[PDB]
Chain length 114, copies 3
């Protein structure tokens, strides 16, 4: 799985340990081993949410399966909770796009996961 967060929160406000925490929590939520989880945080962005520039985040989660109605609600609670606790971003200023990838459409290690 791959999780990306783009945010206007400044780099110095991203706490130590954040990428590991994301990795761990996503391994647990998706059921996939942590060795397969990739995470990416992009602070200091020029962004607005609903016409204002208070802290916000635009995110994506791509996974080979483990995407669906109930699962996505659970991921959103988890991820908004982490962004609120750690980055002080209000959950109503977070969007997360979920993408169920086919294995043949994910490249890795000179081939695909097919």
């Amino acid at each position: 799985p791959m999780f990306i967060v783009n945010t206007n929160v400044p780099r110095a406000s991203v706490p130590d340990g954040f990428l590991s925490e994301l990795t761990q929590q996503l391994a647990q939520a998706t059921g996939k081993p942590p060795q397969y989880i990739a995470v990416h945080v992009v602070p200091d962005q020029l962004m607005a949410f609903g016409g204002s520039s208070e802290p916000c985040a635009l995110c994506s989660l791509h996974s080979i399966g483990k995407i669906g109605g109930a699962q996505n609600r659970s991921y959103s609670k988890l991820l908004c909770g982490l962004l609120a606790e750690r980055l002080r971003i209000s959950p109503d200023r977070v969007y997360i796009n979920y993408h169920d990838m086919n294995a043949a459409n994910v490249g890795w290690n000179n081939s695909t996961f097919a």
Copy 2:
């Protein structure tokens, strides 16, 4: 909706007011309230279009509905017009990927839009 533009134009060349303009114009175009429009501009990027480093942009528009053949043509005229007028990017050096998202695949506010 979420609109992202990645460009090699320098940050100083992005007008004050640009995020607000995008917000307002996208609210009008999509028919969605401005409160739900998110915009993100990323200048100073290392990119090429057709092998050239002249000004260019790579963009995306994700929306729950309001995506289709005629709508996307209209969005493209609007958004290339704004990039031309405000960032001085030729329309033939812009790509915009349009994505019709299912509500169950968009997280927001500790849940999804489903």
Copy 3:
């Protein structure tokens, strides 16, 4: 085609000529005319792969057609090979999301490709 690479490799480790090499090799691999190939490299990122901050890359290739099981395996060998040779990134620390775009969902030059 649009190819994006996000990496924790520093900017100074991205060799001169890399965008041009990507453009050329993607035009050949995809069959597409070089004029339609866009490339974007984003160094210095805060990212982890498998919990580890060793060099890694998170990438995407969007194309109107030319996406499929065998094609994507071929792209992955090409692109992981270039990332290994030029950026010193292990192929097993690269993910590439492949996306087959509908022509009606790609904006360019004030319109779409449909």
